[PDB]
Design a protein around this motif. Structure first.
Motif, short mmCIF file in Angstrom:
data_model
loop_
_atom_site.label_atom_id
_atom_site.label_comp_id
_atom_site.label_asym_id
_atom_site.label_seq_id
_atom_site.Cartn_x
_atom_site.Cartn_y
_atom_site.Cartn_z
N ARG A 4 -40.48 27.01 -37.48
CA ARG A 4 -41.12 26.53 -36.26
C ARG A 4 -41.08 27.56 -35.10
O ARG A 4 -42.09 27.76 -34.43
CB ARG A 4 -40.37 25.24 -35.82
CG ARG A 4 -41.23 24.08 -35.59
CD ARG A 4 -40.42 22.83 -35.16
NE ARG A 4 -40.44 21.77 -36.17
CZ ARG A 4 -41.44 20.90 -36.32
NH1 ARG A 4 -42.51 20.96 -35.54
NH2 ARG A 4 -41.36 19.98 -37.27
N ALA A 5 -39.91 28.16 -34.84
CA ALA A 5 -39.78 29.13 -33.71
C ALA A 5 -40.50 30.47 -33.98
O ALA A 5 -41.02 31.11 -33.06
CB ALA A 5 -38.31 29.37 -33.38
N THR A 6 -40.53 30.87 -35.24
CA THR A 6 -41.20 32.11 -35.67
C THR A 6 -42.71 32.02 -35.49
O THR A 6 -43.32 32.96 -35.03
CB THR A 6 -40.76 32.51 -37.11
OG1 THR A 6 -39.34 32.68 -37.11
CG2 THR A 6 -41.44 33.80 -37.61
N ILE A 7 -43.30 30.88 -35.85
CA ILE A 7 -44.75 30.70 -35.75
C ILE A 7 -45.16 30.73 -34.30
O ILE A 7 -46.09 31.41 -33.93
CB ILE A 7 -45.26 29.40 -36.46
CG1 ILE A 7 -44.94 29.43 -37.94
CG2 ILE A 7 -46.80 29.24 -36.27
CD1 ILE A 7 -45.64 30.58 -38.69
N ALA A 8 -44.46 29.98 -33.46
CA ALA A 8 -44.81 29.95 -32.06
C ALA A 8 -44.60 31.36 -31.45
O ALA A 8 -45.43 31.87 -30.70
CB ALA A 8 -44.00 28.84 -31.32
N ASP A 9 -43.50 32.02 -31.80
CA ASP A 9 -43.26 33.37 -31.32
C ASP A 9 -44.31 34.39 -31.76
O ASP A 9 -44.70 35.22 -30.96
CB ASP A 9 -41.88 33.83 -31.72
CG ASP A 9 -41.55 35.19 -31.17
OD1 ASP A 9 -41.52 35.35 -29.93
OD2 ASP A 9 -41.32 36.12 -31.98
#
Ligand code: HEM
Ligand code: HEM
Ligand code: HEM
Ligand code: HEM
Lengths: 142, 146, 142, 146
Positions: B8-13
């Motif tokens: 989740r955090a990787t995609i948004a980043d």
């Protein structure tokens, strides 16, 4: 078929990556295993699949050597890669649907390290190259 | 799908780092040049029998930007991607008849444009999360049998 | 690559089907259009897409002559189908994803009329032929 | 999927004509002979690389029978194939890591075996209904993202 232009582009890339080739192979393999875990079955004898583990480093060198042979044999990949084809068909029996996966992971890896070489026309030549290598490795399956 | 915190955090980043216009135009142009048969779906976007013509084609740039914003839609609805893409799937299957292999060709071109921009930060683990997201997207964009 | 075994097997089939070849072409195309309707967009000229419709009949003879050509040229398919490869890339711009669909429809059509010719080893020879035909028609795309 | 009456009748009509042991055995043998790399997935099934060896193999015969009964479950649950195949999809991806191209290869082999058996009865209309059925089946067997 590869054009003389495609072969020139491929040879020029291979020149540029020399100092980083062994690290390119190890990283690309590390990418395949983590990103496409269906490929791990072929390597279930490595306890550490991270790109700094000894078996992955050492097999990344072998792959890049097989690709240096492909570069040497670029005028007739089919004849040039015949033993490697029979190996991946009959000793290892690798689902030849996995070849395009590894080619993609090599391209991705190359892109992260050498982004200025990834012009669209250069990319087209490199993709035609890895497609021909895969079709050559697929020769002896049947 | 179930997302981990890291996924989740990787995609948004990743998306927080992309110029949608730059990346989208580069991505669509890359697909049309590397896989030239994909041009036939776009028979309403001016001239396309030439890399220079594809590279400076304003409609290709505009539609590339559209695709990135369409992907951004999935980023904002990570747990509802199928329904989010319900009408796009109908469009790309029933109206446009896009062979599904083409979704993989384009995804692969995005990955390589993204890799070249992000550099050593696009590690195997980041790419793993990125590829899971594109597989979810491609699955929801294809013909829906269920 | 097709073995001499594969080549004989393909040529003998083409011989057995001679009588019925125009029919086989018409029906297989009919099958492609009805079974895989994504293919209809390439033919949105034809008034009627039924088996029995004169444009389907006529173009079916046309596909089958292209295949009896491939059969005559079986030793170097790339050379022998260069013009048809060019036509399918630049005049039409057929998605080569579609080449595999027509091949299967022809295999299916032949299986309905000539079931005894379809032993697994024979089916293997025919599939290697049609895969080689498609690769040849794909040569001029890039 | 929304099934027509013709489609439901055709599909049950085809399976009611097939001997599951005979046809399943033939389909699997056909796949392992025509696309011999599929043999890797059954490496614990015995004598396997001469062609008379594959045709004579009792394990292959048995597993081909199992496939046809698996398809029967979708024939008796045509409006609920995805749920019916939830465990089989997990099995063929998470456990066996079967590349999804292989579901198409096997499907094509079955179609050819069926066309040979049914002859003139396997018209394009009939084939169309069969292929729609196989496409729903294959989509349910592949890895599920939603
Ligand atoms: C770019 C295409 C590929 C090339 C050039 C290549 C090259 C090679 C070479 C040169 C070897 C010999 C190893 C040695 O001497 O010790 C090898 C072995 C092997 N390859 Fe590949 N290969 C490719 C693709 C693949 C793929 C896609 C897979 C599986 C997903 C695979 C699985 C294997 C395995 C299991 C071995 C034996 C490993 C071992 O000895 O520990 N290869 N390959
Ligand atoms: C990740 C993959 C893709 C995404 C997220 C995506 C998204 C979109 C979006 C948002 C639109 C605008 C829809 C509308 O106007 O309501 C669109 C249109 C369209 N797409 Fe895709 N698309 C993708 C892949 C593809 C591929 C691979 C092709 C063909 C190779 C394709 C061909 C088209 C065409 C022909 C249109 C209509 C163009 C026009 O008339 O303006 N798309 N897509
Ligand atoms: C085994 C594969 C195929 C062969 C051997 C083949 C052969 C031929 C031949 C001989 C022609 C006639 C060209 C002329 O009149 O000079 C033709 C035209 C054509 N082909 Fe194919 N073809 C094949 C596959 C396909 C596929 C898969 C499609 C698309 C789904 C396609 C679409 C067309 C179209 C639209 C024409 C023009 C027909 C017309 O203008 O009426 N072909 N092909
Ligand atoms: C229409 C496609 C298919 C159907 C309906 C199907 C169905 C089944 C079923 C019902 C089982 C038994 C699972 C259980 O014990 O409950 C099974 C097992 C298995 N399948 Fe498939 N399968 C299909 C395609 C494939 C393909 C294409 C492959 C390989 C490339 C494959 C590989 C296997 C393997 C290795 C097993 C375990 C064998 C055993 O011990 O029974 N399957 N499948």
């Amino acid at each position: 078929s590869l054009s003389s232009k495609d072969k020139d582009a491929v040879k020029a890339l291979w020149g540029k990556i020399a100092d980083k080739a062994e690290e390119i192979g190890a990283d690309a393999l590390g990418r395949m295993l983590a990103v496409y875990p269906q490929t791990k079955t072929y390597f279930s004898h490595w306890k550490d699949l991270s790109p700094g583990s000894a078996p992955v480093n050492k097999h990344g060198k072998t792959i890049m050597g097989g690709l240096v042979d492909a570069v040497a044999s670029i005028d007739d990949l089919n004849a040039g890669l015949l033993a490697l084809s029979e190996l991946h068909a009959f000793t290892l029996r690798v689902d030849p649907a996995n070849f395009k996966i590894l080619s993609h992971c090599i391209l991705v890896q190359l892109a992260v390290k050498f982004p200025k070489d990834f012009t669209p026309e250069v990319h087209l030549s490199y993709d035609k190259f890895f497609s021909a290598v895969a079709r050559a490795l697929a020769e002896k399956y049947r | 799908v179930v997302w981990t915190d890291f996924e989740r955090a990787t995609i948004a980043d990743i998306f927080s780092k992309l110029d949608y216009e730059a990346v989208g135009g580069a991505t669509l142009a890359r697909c049309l040049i590397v896989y030239p048969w994909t041009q036939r779906y776009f028979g309403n976007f001016g001239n396309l029998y030439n890399a220079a013509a594809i590279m400076g084609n304003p409609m290709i740039a505009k539609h590339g930007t559209t695709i990135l914003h369409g992907l951004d839609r999935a980023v904002k609805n990570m747990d509802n991607i199928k329904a989010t893409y319900a009408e796009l799937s109908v469009l790309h299957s029933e109206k446009l008849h896009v062979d599904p292999d083409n979704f993989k060709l384009l995804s692969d071109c995005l990955t390589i444009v993204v890799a070249a921009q992000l550099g050593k930060a696009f590690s195997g683990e980041v790419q793993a999360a990125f590829q899971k997201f594109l597989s979810v997207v491609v699955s929801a964009l294809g013909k829906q049998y269920h």
